[PDB]
Design a protein around this ligand. Sequence first.
Ligand SMILES: CC(=O)Nc1nnc(S(N)(=O)=O)s1
Ligand SMILES: CC(=O)Nc1nnc(S(N)(=O)=O)s1
Ligand SMILES: [Zn+2]
Ligand SMILES: [Zn+2]
Lengths: 223, 223
Amino acid sequence: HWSYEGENGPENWAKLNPEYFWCNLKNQSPVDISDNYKVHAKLEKLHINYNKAVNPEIVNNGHTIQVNVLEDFKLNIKGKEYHLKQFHFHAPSEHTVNGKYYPLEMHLVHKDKDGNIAVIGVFFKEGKANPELDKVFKNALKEEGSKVFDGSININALLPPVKNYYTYSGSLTTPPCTEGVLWIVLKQPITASKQQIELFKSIMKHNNNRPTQPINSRYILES
Amino acid sequence: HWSYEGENGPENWAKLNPEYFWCNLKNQSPVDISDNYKVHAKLEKLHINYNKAVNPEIVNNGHTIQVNVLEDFKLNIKGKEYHLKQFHFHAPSEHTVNGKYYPLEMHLVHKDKDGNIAVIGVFFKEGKANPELDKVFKNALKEEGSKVFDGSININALLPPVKNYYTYSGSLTTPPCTEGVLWIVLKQPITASKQQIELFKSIMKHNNNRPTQPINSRYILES
Ligand SMILES: CC(=O)Nc1nnc(S(N)(=O)=O)s1
Ligand SMILES: CC(=O)Nc1nnc(S(N)(=O)=O)s1
Ligand SMILES: [Zn+2]
Ligand SMILES: [Zn+2]
């Protein structure tokens, strides 16, 4: 089984299972979003409205706290119609901006009818507490397992008002590290209280962010 | 052995050898350079001066006619210092522009000190004959083999005056189809005479262009 340290750490994920060959390729995530290879461009506007997920499932799978939604929220971008499947968290953040780590990163995982994946990343900096985050972190089991949250979560409240973003072609950040992933990282971080961030970290017991990967021949676009 | 048709055709390259696993991944070349996923941006200017290659080696390797240069022509771009190694040809072209094929495409293959690859592609449309092309095609062996050209080739004469270009992250277009390749396709095609184009095609005996591949989560930048 893979982990974020030791023999089964990120550096040896590709050795754990034949299906993890992707982890050693040339278009991996996360990456350092650097001005060195970031270019500004007129990009498609992000149109999403994740109203609210009613009675979503909160899962502790040992590697993160994930929320599986029952609704069918659509993300239409780059000629595809992706459907939100779940969002989860990483602490510290996986992506960095000019070398800077944020204390928390949320990933909204979408998939289209053909299995294509798009992930929207949201950075969280310490500050005013976020209402929705308590619903997730305080109702997450401390041990591996799932639980149905008796209530609803306003996902829009887990997103910044302005949705300018960075985008690049990458991969899943945990085995099998499949590539061909469409990454959309919102430029504006929102806030989470120190207690919310520490609660998540204390549940995980360890950092669950994959080291940044070489950008190689890719450029990152910024809207 | 792989080919451009039959059992060993492009569709089954990945089955020929374990090392060809790349041919089935998510960041393959060539691609259709489509306005649907092409974005304009301020890109690094292309600074290259491939003066002339003296006594280069002309090789017919059965899949193309390739010219190996002895000089050390540098291509400095995207934070790397690539060195020109050789240029070769494909007929019809490999890349297309909004679905349009050109009769001929030239590839200038560069590699840096770490093995990183950058390929500059040049489209040729039928028209005024190109002086340099005769040096290559008329001196290429009709059967597999190499030969040293007794003369010099002005590579700059194989490039358009204006060097605006498209760029994207891709792969080699023949096995092993390694990814992480930096592609730079010059937007302006130059000309080759119908006879020059047919001479190359008659030597090859068959089309030697790989089918275009899915762009997947990549965008193509245009300077
Ligand atoms: C089952 C599933 O979604 N797996 C993922 N692996 N990595 C992901 S991430 N961090 O790139 O969003 S999602
Ligand atoms: C040895 C070598 O250079 N191999 C190549 N395979 N494909 C290439 S291409 N068409 O992408 O320039 S170069
Ligand atoms: Zn994630
Ligand atoms: Zn080629």
